[PDB]
């Protein structure tokens, strides 16, 4: 959570400080490897083809195998031997011509870099691959941008701004097989009920002679896909190796990073670029999340406000944290018994 001053004329909280919880998401740069074009038909959109980058990393090609280490590792081998030959250049020029003539949508195939995200609890080593659409301009201009962004890295600062909003496509935390009280929120029955309380008493009338799809039943809860629009960006950070003072504010000159004391519980250190979003986000820690540019109109006063942070909390999330940095702890306690022994051994 953070502290900031709110600018909102006509409100009882105007020009005062508030406390708002936030979410931290690690954002290593992505790599673009492909271009796909779509044409519109009376039955829907159909893919025209794909243009590949001729140079792919090991973590990208891991996605095509279930046991990569004990395998021949032959993916994309023939394409590499053929792409730059005279027949190879002609074939690519043919596909690009079809993109120009008969396409309405241009997208790029991109994958994350799990080697740079040096996380100990994320066990997967094969990259996550997805498609990202290019908006704006004409078809000719769209293709030019896609070709320029081939084999290169894309940073999150080039896609989003500091005080904008975004959408959060994610998958919810799982709960397994759960009953109607937790799954749907129905009332519990009186203490005297024979054969149990946590149930729906009547699941239908005599007619129609069947159970309808609108009645609550027990089953799977959680692990669903949601969208949850209109989440405001509060900060666009950079990697701790290049900018050590991540959580330092103009109103708080302490030098500290975004990682709490003792690390994020179950996750660890944030060693990469990151985004700070206001509020909550679906899913547990370590899950991969997609952020999208908004669909709803962004002309409201709440969505156009400029955010200036004042204080970022970095106390330990284990127990009741009460120190902001490690120096605060070493100033409250003086030298301890173990420090004295180390000094005595140094003598």
């Amino acid at each position: 959570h953070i502290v900031r001053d709110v600018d909102r004329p006509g409100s009882k909280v105007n020009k005062k400080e508030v406390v708002e919880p936030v979410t931290i998401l690690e954002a290593p740069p992505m790599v673009v490897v492909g271009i796909v074009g779509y044409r519109q038909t009376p039955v829907g959109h159909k893919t025209i083809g794909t243009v590949w980058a001729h140079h792919t990393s090991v973590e990208f090609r891991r996605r095509f195998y279930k046991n990569w280490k004990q395998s021949a590792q032959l993916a994309f081998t023939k394409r590499k031997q053929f792409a730059r030959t005279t027949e190879g250049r002609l074939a690519e020029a043919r596909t690009l011509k079809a993109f120009e003539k008969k396409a309405d949508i241009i997208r790029v195939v991109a994958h994350t870099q799990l080697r740079k995200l040096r996380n100990n609890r994320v066990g997967v080593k094969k990259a996550h691959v997805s498609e990202i659409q290019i908006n704006g301009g004409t078809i000719a201009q769209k293709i030019e941008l896609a070709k320029s962004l081939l084999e290169k890295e894309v940073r999150i600062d080039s896609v989003f701004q500091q005080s904008e909003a975004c959408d959060v496509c994610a998958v919810t935390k799982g709960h397994g097989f759960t009953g109607v009280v937790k799954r749907w929120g129905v009332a519990c029955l009186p203490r005297k009920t024979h054969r149990g309380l946590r149930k729906v008493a009547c699941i239908g009338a005599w007619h129609p002679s069947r159970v309808m799809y609108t009645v609550a039943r027990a089953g799977q809860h959680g692990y669903h896909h949601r969208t949850h629009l209109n989440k405001k960006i509060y900060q666009l950070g950079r990697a701790v190796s290049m900018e050590p003072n991540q959580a330092t504010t103009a109103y708080d000159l302490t030098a500290k990073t975004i990682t709490p004391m003792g690390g994020f519980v179950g996750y660890g250190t944030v060693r990469n670029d990151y985004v700070m979003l206001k509020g909550s986000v679906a899913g547990p820690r370590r899950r991969v999340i997609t952020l999208r540019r908004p669909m709803a109109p962004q002309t409201s006063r709440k969505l156009t406000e400029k955010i200036t942070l004042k204080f970022i909390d970095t106390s330990s999330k284990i127990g009741h944290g009460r120190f902001q940095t490690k120096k605060e702890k070493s100033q409250w306690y003086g030298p301890l018994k173990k420090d004295r022994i180390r000094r005595e051994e140094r003598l």
Binding site: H1, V3, K12, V13, K16, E17, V18, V19, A187
Partner: protein, 129 residues
């Protein structure tokens, strides 16, 4: 209007009377501005006007329905600045339907949430908290 605070006082609660009208406690009958919901009891928080009856005190104030305002509550609530605060007891003062105090003094502190809504109560408060 005001920001929402935790409810803390369902119908049937008995709270102290903080003015000097001769009443000792108040029994909450209902809360103003409650839109119903099946099986849910109306509940009153700080700065809420309630309908109440006196169960202890001068016989002249008893056996009739009055108006009152809640000024202290034991259930903690969170302010917009992130602070959680609570009192030691629940209390209220007898008031007329317009909002003017029947008494002339108040014992104990008065919540800031109740003070801004009712200007007359702000005058007689020993302390605004």
């Amino acid at each position: 209007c005001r920001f929402r605070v935790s409810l803390a006082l369902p119908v049937g609660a008995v709270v102290n009377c903080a003015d000097n009208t001769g009443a000792k406690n108040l029994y909450i009958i209902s809360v103003k501005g409650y839109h119903g919901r099946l099986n849910r009891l109306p509940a009153a928080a700080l700065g809420d006007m309630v309908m109440a009856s006196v169960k202890k005190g001068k016989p002249e104030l008893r056996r009739k329905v009055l108006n009152a305002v809640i000024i202290r509550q034991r259930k903690s609530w969170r302010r917009k600045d992130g602070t959680v605060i609570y009192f030691e007891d629940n209390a209220g003062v007898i008031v007329n339907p317009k909002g003017e105090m029947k008494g002339s003094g108040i014992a104990g502190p008065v919540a800031k949430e109740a003070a801004e809504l009712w200007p007359k109560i702000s005058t007689h408060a020993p302390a605004i908290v």
